[PDB]
Amino acid sequence: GVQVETISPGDGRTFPKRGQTVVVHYTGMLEDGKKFDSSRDRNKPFKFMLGKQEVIRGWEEGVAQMSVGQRAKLTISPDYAYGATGHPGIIPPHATLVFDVELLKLE
Numbered sequence: 001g002v003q004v005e006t007i008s009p010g011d012g013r014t015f016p017k018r019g020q021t022v023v024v025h026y027t028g029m030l031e032d033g034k035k036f037d038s039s040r041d042r043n044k045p046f047k048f049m050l051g052k053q054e055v056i057r058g059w060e061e062g063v064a065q066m067s068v069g070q071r072a073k074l075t076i077s078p079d080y081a082y083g084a085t086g087h088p089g090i091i092p093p094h095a096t097l098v099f100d101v102e103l104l105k106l107e
């Protein structure tokens with residue numbers, strides 16, 4: 001599944017709702033290992049719409065538990081991420097992923 005560990009609290013009341021655009025900054029790494037991507041490196045937040053199967057399952061479930069302004073560490077098992085095959089060039093097979101995610105706003 002996905003484990004959410006709070007780094008910095010959000011407002012504790014404003015959570016993503018189905019059909020909203022969720023706006024975040026993140027950095028992703030293999031667990032206790034190497035970084036593979038950061039929205040911060042592009043100076044452009046990442047957006048996705050909740051409820052539209054736009055992201056891996058661990059994101060969908062993990063980010064939904066976050067309130068606006070929260071920063072958290074999401075640890076995502078392979079079956080909640082890229083599973084047995086990974087993703088070419090970026091995620092290996094059977095990989096546990098860790099994302100540092102900051103929920104900036106809901107649009």
Ligand SMILES: C=C[C@H]1CN(Cc2ccccn2)C(=O)[C@@H]2CCC[C@H]1N2[S@@](=O)(=NC)c1cc(Cl)cc(Cl)c1
Pocket residue numbers: 028036037046054055056059087090091
């Ligand atoms: C920047 C885009 C998303 C990509 N996706 C959705 C996804 C993943 C694979 C193929 C199609 N769509 C995701 O579900 C996850 C988590 C949300 C942040 C990014 N990824 S990602 O960091 N996963 C290793 C990723 C994945 C790709 Cl194909 C490119 C980039 Cl720049 C980053």
